[PDB]
Design a binder for these strands. Structure first.
Lengths: 716, 98, 735, 249
RNA sequence: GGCCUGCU
RNA sequence: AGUAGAAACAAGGCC
């Protein structure tokens, strides 16, 4: 039958009908009479629509061939011959522009004169039944319907026929051409009734070929095919198989509970080796401040001018000389770098306006100090294979180092009060609710407690230094840059003040990965002689740069004044995390506020004021040789803030591992102290897990010592 | 509705013979020389003065074909020969006599 | 006196101050170089936990595979992957018996979803291993490349737009003699059957960074695109199953987890009378993923899909069949340094099979020596067990089956147990009349776990009396206690854009106040610090200050120009009006009534060249990877302002041979923008159909010109011009 | 006019012509998401790192013809170098602030009508009345509650057709909404937003947010009302309760 | 010396 | 040298 559509109809219509065939997903080889019927429907749609044009009037202009002009409007514009999505697109667009009603089924054409749709259907059966059939299929329709049938008859409601009658003679001539051409073909044994509305399909997902063999190799050891295994599974029913293997399984497979008593836990062993060194990016306990007493705010001002003005406030400069060498570098380079920094600072002082940011010369001194041109050149393996020295990067456990007493004193003095306010908080919306007033009062109390704390000063120092370093690295990637360490505080009298700890020289910072390292050299003034705790300054070079006179009742001290100079490095991640050190304030004060709220849930009243003023209640916050010492809530605030600050400063994988594996043991010990009969399956394994995190970090070793002390004081 | 295809043209000798056929009502054969418009040849019977006695028109209504049997050809018969139905025109078949 | 914060625990219980034990204020550990060492170590460890299995060689991939299932029962407490098929089938049968109709229903909804799912659902995924280039690429890019290759090779069933048809094409590709791929350096290369099989069965290994809570780094894996559809269907089934199990806690959030934990502890302890003792085990499973054999997941799913259409069973079984034969790419490679000659070199991992061992240290030398036998075409066969939690939900199903297997109806003894399982972590409440009963119950639970290939970490687990325990960093002590140290890293600028960062910060403060019991004063301090950091990050200072920045001049002139300066946004250098009462209001709407009409109009102008919206999914959704958890998405309330710009892209593609991808990106985006202008609903609802672009665009041009004349700007001249231009593009597409 | 013209210009060049011809409508989404840009793992780090560069943001090409290349002192506002995989150009953040002080102005009166949810929140809070804070232990119990206070009793898919018919009336397709509540919602949001020119996508997104019901599990103590849950952070705490009555009541 | 890139 | 820690940075590539 398909030979007929090969022969007669034009290409355009046959591929339109083929795409309509693909539309609903049925195959053309099984039933083709539908293809012919609907392609004839589509053909009558065209032949009825084309050759029919309109101009600004009604009364369509009919031309056998559209002449070249702007007057190519089509009388009837076709609906079908398009995908369902576009057919409904045209339906909705016509409804929204023509203000007509939206039909629920697919029309075939639209006309302007009568401003409505045409649903053309030419069926094998006579018209006077198919018409009202499709009419009762369509609900309350104003779209006019018109149908032909092979006998040659026409019909329509309203007795309406919308265009010329010679066109309809055309239609029925086409119709009988179709008819008495099948006459030569002979199809009416099924042509009248060949489609009955079949819609059914079964989804087929068959495993075959290579993928089947893979299925045959992904079974238990004693199975040969997926078919057999699935049959076995379907036939499988529970018949007490877990019990049999449990009985047969060796009894050494057990989870015996070892009781956890007061005498069970042993102190954590600390590693032994050379004392632990300093790792901070700046001096914390041995910092010195040169000040100007200016009225500018933290960010307000220009760095270089402030630094120069602060440094001019000090008199007593001496020619620098080596006091304590780096022990691994070239100290003369550090000396020359310091003198170069001074010289270029003067050079800025001379000229017209202090630059906002200064670049330094790339001398051999800072070329060595900043580690320039030291990365091995990257080459290909095929060119370097016979080199005996060629091997992997050194990948082994870090060097072992024992704890020293300097970190303990540094933390002790990091929780001490100061003679300045190191936090100038921002603005918030004016409090409107009583709860907001309570929150503001609490916040004011904590700010009064923590602002005068060395932890806040360290927070500001780190934030400013890391912000400046990151910005300089991102801006001046190539050229070495000078950045004075600046921090602005407010005195007890209320006068604002600036403080200059020293200088940082940032080097080449072409940082691609988050782990890539930018090297800088840090110089900081101090008065602490490095000849008393040399092991804490393994990586520092310390010079003697001047003498300071601070008013004291013992005449006047006239102390020496040294310069701690070192080469340090950071990374994008480290800079970003060090510039978010202000969340240590959060951590600490959230803990304290949780304490206050928990206690106030007992007594139905806010308990902040008496906690902060009466200072009757105290918490164990340290141990003295006499015994455990307790301090007021403010001291707890400062201690927790210092702990968070040191966590942010000495952060490392060792800290995370020890924190987790020691929190586990802390929970076990707490369960013991709560009389909850705690038990363990392998306590030695937990101890070994904790002890492997303690390698060389001073902070984690101090935490381990604190944990041992807590165990000793606990378990009683 | 009526498509038409001509066959049987080509290069021929002067005095030679040629059978045009047109596969597809009354039918006509018309010709067009390169320097002119349409010229009547034959219709079905009637023939033009320049081709009478030389050429014969015939049709098989069971094969749906009209034939033009050309004999004793002249260089002046050189034209595209078009078949026509009566409004419907073939594309024409080239006849070149030399 | 020496200060010691830990001594604070002598007065404050450990859980009431547990936040102090979370050093989440410093930089988390990161990996620096290759992850090849970790990948090799994981492969060797997975293969040696199942050493007593049986060896075979796949006839298709030619790789050695180790099957430990039904192997000898363990005789020691070391990790073991010798799961027994009959035991696990019985466990699943008991799970079904205790929850009748679970499998049949879940299979019904899964069948619905599978037969109505679309291909585009695969684009909604993070990095995936594209085999066309042998590298990780965004899910959409890899899917597009694979579809292009399939269409070039003759597999065009995916044009049906159905994920099931895409999987049919994927499987049909397995039986092809020779496929063709494209490489740029374009060159057409031919892949034989075995090479393509291994490229479709392989995984890409990387090192996990920003992982807090352990000293050593780990390795993670990413699968290809051929196997992700089957994984999607299997995980859909597993999620539908777990949603019907109250003992599971994987498909829920954190608060739901806490609620279920509280309910289970109350149920276990309350029902226990005075005679029965109760004990809670806070258990962690050692080597959870390395001991879960994909064959056992195949067994579980084929038991689940019993009495179901065979096509459903096949499509759900394809995934574990491929995991059982999965291969893993070793990784980036290894970098060597020579100090004598002062140079460095980078050898790819694919050379580990043949490269001499003189360059490697003892540990790496031994690892390579042990893993070499499993190396096939630069990748190692990893049949014995899963790599990194790809089947999280099925593992949770197995754990829930174990938990339910002790409902006192199967224990047949006075002791019994229950609890909650979330993959790699569990809380187990066991009750028994005497300590001997508790010991026997825990011993039998451990033994049954060892029969299913699941191991309990004795070093990271402990048992106490009920009332105090831990679960996924949630510490329960007669009621869950807030931590607030897990969410600390999320208190900074997110890094999306100005308006997005502001809204996200305020919303995070609000949420942590609602959930993590953040205090009022602490919340105010957090708001102040966040505002400070926000102003210092975006160079948007109050405007009345003299802080010179790259943006302080325009901000200052805008400040001096504005009359009601209280309406200026913090992004434009205005005062901050936020407070505890205003944390749930966008900044634009909070300052709407205070803005000057000129500044208000300039700010919220639709014609601004900065705002760009791509799809309904990416309107106000921000992907923030939370600390100590998987990547998560958040809805943030924000008004589309001129500050909603999107930041610069990487721009490093220009120096790579893969430079033509940018031209393809630009052309695809131009075509997509044209289509959207032709089809405005393209973004909100993704268009569907089987036609091509130009057909729809030209036809809609026809119709829209028509109707927009029937009322609108068009004129006959223009309408006819459009009609004949449509004809022109038609004949152009013809040729 | 224009649209078909850039269509023809695209089809003029062979590569785009092939892309338009061979690519089917269904693959629309795929190729639209086809990109070499990886999703950032650490957005904060790079946002703090990119903002230190010049020209850190991106904007459409049109910015080159609305904003001058430099400001009064000569600080550059935009660059002509396009982004990696787009025709957009990289520009400095000042071009934002500049746009807010001398850029074109419009009538933003209809934004309150569009962003109905946020402005309703603001109005509800502005007329709220606070009360005394009572300090007592709060038994926070976890419950499933609806957060959206303006949901019109419609699901996502249920209101998606409404949203399309309100914004994209022609792409609705087969669906014609039956429920009369949807009829009235369509009428109201059609006549209200008849000429709003913000964007079809944002309008659809905000209509989805407003009408679609959404639910989440939260620890609550009292309240349980939709209006009382949006301020759950302000009314309920660990040991304090703040009586509050939104402006709606 | 000149120019390109900074998660590809 | 320095940062850092089971492998890396201490710029890369292209002419």
């Amino acid at each position: 039958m398909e030979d007929f559509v090969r022969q007669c109809f034009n290409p355009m219509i046959v591929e339109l009908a083929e795409k309509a065939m693909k539309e609903y997903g049925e195959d053309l080889k099984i039933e083709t009479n539908k293809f012919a019927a609907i392609c004839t429907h589509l053909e009558v749609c065209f032949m009825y629509s084309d050759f029919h044009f309109i101009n600004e009037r009604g009364e369509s202009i009919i031309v056998e061939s559209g002449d070249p002009n702007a007057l190519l409007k089509h009388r009837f514009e076709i609906i079908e011959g398009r995908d369902r999505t576009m057919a409904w697109t045209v339906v909705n667009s016509i409804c929204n522009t023509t203000g007509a009603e939206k039909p629920k089924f697919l029309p075939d054409l639209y006309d302007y004169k009568e401003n409505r749709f045409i649903e053309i259907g030419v069926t094998r059966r006579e018209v006077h039944i198919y018409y009202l059939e499709k009419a009762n299929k369509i609900k309350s329709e104003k779209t006019h319907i018109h149908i032909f049938s092979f006998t040659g008859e026409e019909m329509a409601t309203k007795a309406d026929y919308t265009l010329d009658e010679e066109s309809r003679a055309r239609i029925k001539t086409r119709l009988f051409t179709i008819r008495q051409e099948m006459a030569s073909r002979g199809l009416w044994d099924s042509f009248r009734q060949s489609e009955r509305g079949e819609e059914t399909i079964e989804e087929r997902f068959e495993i075959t070929g290579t993928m089947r063999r893979l299925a045959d190799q992904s079974l238990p050891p004693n199975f040969s095919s997926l078919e057999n295994f699935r049959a076995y599974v379907d036939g499988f029913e529970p018949n007490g198989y877990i019990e049999g293997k449990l009985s047969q399984m060796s009894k050494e497979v057990n989870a015996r509970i070892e009781p956890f008593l007061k005498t069970t836990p042993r102190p954590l062993r600390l590693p032994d080796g050379p004392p632990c060194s300093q790792r901070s990016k700046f001096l914390l306990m041995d910092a010195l401040k040169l000040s100007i007493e200016d009225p500018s705010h933290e960010g307000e001002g220009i760095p270089l001018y402030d630094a120069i003005k602060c440094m001019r406030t000090f008199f007593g400069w001496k020619e620098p000389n080596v006091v304590k060498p780096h022990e691994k570098g070239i100290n003369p380079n550090y000396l020359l770098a310091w003198k170069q920094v001074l010289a270029e600072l003067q050079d800025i002082e001379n000229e017209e306006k202090i630059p906002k940011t200064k670049n330094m010369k790339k001398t051999s001194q800072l070329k060595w100090a900043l580690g320039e041109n030291m990365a091995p050149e990257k080459v290909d393996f095929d060119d370097c294979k016979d080199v005996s020295d060629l091997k992997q990067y050194d990948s082994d456990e870090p060097e072992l180092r024992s704890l020293a007493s300097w970190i303990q004193s540094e933390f002790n003095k990091a929780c001490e009060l100061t003679d300045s306010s190191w936090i100038e908080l921002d603005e918030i919306g004016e409090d409107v609710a009583p709860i907001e007033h309570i929150a503001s009062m609490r916040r004011n109390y904590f700010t009064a407690e923590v602002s005068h704390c060395r932890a806040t000063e360290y927070i500001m120092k780190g934030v400013y230094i890391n912000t400046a370093l990151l910005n300089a690295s991102c801006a001046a990637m190539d050229d070495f840059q000078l950045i004075p360490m600046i921090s602005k505080c407010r005195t007890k009298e209320g006068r604002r003040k600036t403080n200059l700890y020293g200088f940082i020289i940032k080097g080449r910072s072409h940082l691609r990965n988050d782990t890539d390292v930018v090297n800088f050299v840090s110089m900081e003034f101090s008065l602490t002689d490095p000849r008393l705790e040399p092991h804490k300054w393994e990586k520092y070079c310390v010079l003697e740069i001047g003498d300071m006179l601070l008013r004291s009742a013992i005449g006047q001290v006239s102390r020496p004044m040294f310069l701690y100079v070192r080469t340090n490095g950071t990374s994008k991640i480290k800079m970003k995390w060090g510039m978010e050190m202000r969340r240590c304030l959060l951590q600490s004060l959230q803990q304290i506020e949780s304490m206050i709220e928990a206690e106030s849930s007992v007594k139905e009243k806010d308990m902040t004021k008496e906690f902060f003023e009466n200072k009757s209640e105290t918490w164990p916050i340290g141990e003295s040789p006499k015994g455990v010492e307790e301090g007021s809530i403010g001291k707890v605030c400062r201690t927790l803030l210092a702990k968070s600050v040191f966590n942010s400063l000495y952060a490392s994988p060792q800290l995370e591992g020890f924190s987790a594996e020691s929190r586990k043991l802390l929970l076990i010990v707490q369960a013991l102290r709560d009389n909850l009969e705690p038990g363990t399956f392998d306590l030695g394994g937990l101890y070994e897990a904790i002890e492997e995190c303690l390698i060389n970090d001073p902070w984690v070793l101090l935490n381990a010592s604190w944990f041992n002390s807590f165990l000793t004081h606990a378990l009683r | 509705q009526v498509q038409l295809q001509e066959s049987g043209g080509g290069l021929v000798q002067t005095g030679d013979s040629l059978r045009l056929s047109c596969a597809g009502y009354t039918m006509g054969w018309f010709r067009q020389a390169p320097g002119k418009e349409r010229e009547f040849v034959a219709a079905i019977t009637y023939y033009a003065e320049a081709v009478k006695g030389r050429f014969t028109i015939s049709r098989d209504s069971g094969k749906n074909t009209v034939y033009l049997q050309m004999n004793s050809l002249k260089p002046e018969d050189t034209a595209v020969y078009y078949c026509a139905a009566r409004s419907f025109w073939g594309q024409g078949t080239q006849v070149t006599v030399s | 006196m020496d200060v010691n914060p830990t001594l604070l625990f002598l007065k404050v219980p450990a859980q009431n101050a547990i936040s102090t034990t979370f050093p989440y204020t410093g930089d988390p550990p990161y990996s620096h170089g290759t992850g090849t060492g970790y990948t090799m170590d994981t492969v060797n460890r997975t293969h040696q936990y199942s050493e007593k299995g049986r060896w075979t060689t796949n006839t298709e991939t030619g790789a050695p595979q180790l099957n430990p299932i039904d192997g000898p029962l363990p005789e020691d407490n070391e990790p073991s992957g010798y799961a027994q098929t009959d035991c696990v089938l019985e466990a699943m049968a008991f799970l079904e018996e205790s929850h009748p109709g679970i499998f049949e229903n879940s299979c019904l909804e899964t069948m619905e979803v599978v037969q109505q799912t679309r291909v585009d659902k695969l684009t909604q995924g993070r990095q995936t291993y594209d085999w066309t280039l042998n590298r990780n690429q965004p899910a959409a890019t890899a899917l597009a490349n694979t579809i292009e290759v399939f269409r070039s090779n003759g597999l065009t069933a995916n044009e049906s737009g159905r994920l099931i048809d895409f999987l049919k094409d994927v499987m049909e590709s397995m039986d092809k003699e020779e496929m063709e791929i494209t490489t740029h350096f374009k060159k057409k290369q031919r892949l034989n059957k075995r090479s393509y099989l291994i490229r479709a069965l392989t995984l890409n290994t990387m090192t996990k960074d920003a992982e807090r809570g352990k000293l050593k780094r780990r390795a993670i894996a990413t699968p290809g695109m051929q196997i992700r559809g089957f994984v999607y269907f299997v995980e859909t089934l597993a999620r539908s199953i777990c949603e019907k199990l109250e003992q599971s806690g994987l498909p829920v959030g954190g608060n739901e987890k806490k609620a279920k934990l509280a309910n289970v502890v109350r149920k276990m302890m309350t029902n226990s009378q005075d005679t029965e003792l109760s004990f809670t085990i806070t258990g962690d499973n050692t080597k959870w993923n390395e001991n879960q054999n994909p064959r056992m997941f195949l067994a579980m799913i084929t038991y689940i899909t019993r009495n179901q259409p065979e096509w459903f069973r096949n499509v759900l079984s394809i995934a574990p069949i491929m995991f059982s034969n999965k291969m893993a790419r070793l990784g980036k490679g290894y970098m060597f340094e020579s100090k004598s000659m002062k140079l460095r070199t980078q050898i790819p991992a694919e050379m580990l099979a043949s490269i001499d061992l003189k360059y490697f240290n003892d540990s790496t030398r031994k690892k390579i020596e042990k893993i070499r036998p499993l190396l096939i075409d630069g990748t190692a066969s990893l049949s014995p067990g899963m790599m990194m939690g790809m089947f999280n939900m099925l593992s949770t199903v197995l754990g829930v089956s174990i938990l339910n297997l002790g409902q006192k109806r199967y224990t047949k003894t006075t002791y019994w147990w229950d609890g909650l399982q979330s993959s790699d972590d569990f809380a187990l409440i066991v009750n028994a009349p005497n300590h001997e009963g508790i010991q026997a119950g825990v011993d039998r639970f451990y033994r049954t776990c060892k029969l299913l290939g699941i191991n309990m970490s004795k070093k990271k687990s402990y048992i106490n009396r009920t009332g105090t325990f831990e679960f996924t960093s949630f510490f329960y002590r007669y009621g869950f206690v807030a931590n607030f140290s897990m969410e600390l890293p999320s208190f900074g600028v997110s890094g999306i854009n100005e308006s997005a960062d502001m809204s996200i910060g305020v919303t995070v403060i609000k949420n942590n106040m609602i959930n993590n019991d953040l205090g009022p004063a602490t919340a105010q301090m957090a708001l102040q610090l966040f505002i400070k950091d926000y102003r210092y990050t975006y160079r948007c200072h109050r405007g009345d200050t003299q802080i010179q920045t790259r943006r302080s001049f325009e901000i200052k002139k805008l400040w001096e120009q504005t009359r009601s300066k209280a309406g200026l946004l913090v992004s434009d250098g205005g005062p901050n009006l936020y407070n505890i009462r205003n944390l749930h209001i966008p900044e634009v709407c909070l300052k709407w009534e205070l803005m000057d009409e000129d500044y208000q109009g300039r700010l919220c102008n639709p014609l601004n060249p900065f705002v760009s919206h791509k799809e309904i999914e990416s309107v106000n959704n921000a992907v923030m990877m939370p600390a100590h958890g998987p990547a998560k998405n958040m809805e943030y309330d924000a008004v589309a302002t001129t500050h909603s710009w999107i930041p610069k892209r990487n721009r490093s593609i220009l120096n790579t041979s893969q430079r033509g991808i940018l031209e393809d990106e630009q052309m695809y985006q131009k075509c997509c923008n044209l289509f959207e202008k032709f089809f405005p609903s393209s973004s909100y609802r993704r268009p569907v159909g089987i036609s091509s672009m130009v057909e729809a665009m030209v036809s809609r041009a026809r119709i829209d010109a028509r109707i927009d004349f029937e009322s609108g700007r068009i004129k006959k001249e223009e309408f006819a011009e459009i009609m004949k231009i449509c004809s022109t593009i038609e004949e152009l597409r013809r040729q | 006019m224009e649209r078909i013209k850039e269509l023809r210009d695209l089809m003029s060049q062979s590569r785009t012509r092939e892309i338009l011809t061979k690519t089917t409508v269904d693959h629309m989404a795929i190729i639209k998401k086809y990109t070499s840009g990886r999703q950032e793992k650490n957005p904060a780090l790079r946002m703090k790192w990119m903002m230190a560069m010049k020209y850190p943001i991106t904007a459409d090409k049109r910015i080159m013809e609305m904003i001058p290349e430099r400001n009064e002192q000569g600080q550059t506002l935009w660059s002509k170098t396009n982004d990696a995989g787009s025709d957009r150009v990289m520009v400095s953040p000042l071009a934002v602030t500049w746009w807010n002080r001398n850029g074109p102005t419009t009538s933003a009166v209809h934004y309150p009508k569009i962003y109905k949810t946020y402005f309703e929140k603001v109005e509800r809070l502005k007329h709220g009345t606070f009360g005394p804070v009572h300090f007592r232990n709060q038994v926070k119990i976890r419950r499933r509650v609806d957060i959206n206070p303006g949901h019109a009793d419609l699901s996502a898919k249920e209101a998606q057709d409404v949203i399309m018919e309100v914004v994209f009336p022609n792409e609705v397709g087969a669906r014609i909404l039956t429920s009369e509540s949807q009829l009235t919602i369509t009428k109201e949001k059609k006549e209200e937003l008849q000429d709003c020119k913000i964007s079809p996508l944002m309008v659809a997104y905000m209509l989805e947010r407003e009408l679609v019901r959404k639910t989440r599990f939260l620890p609550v103590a009292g309240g349980t009302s939709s209006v009382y849950i949006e301020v759950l952070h302000l009314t309920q705490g660990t040991c304090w309760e703040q009586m509050y009555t939104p402006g709606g009541e």
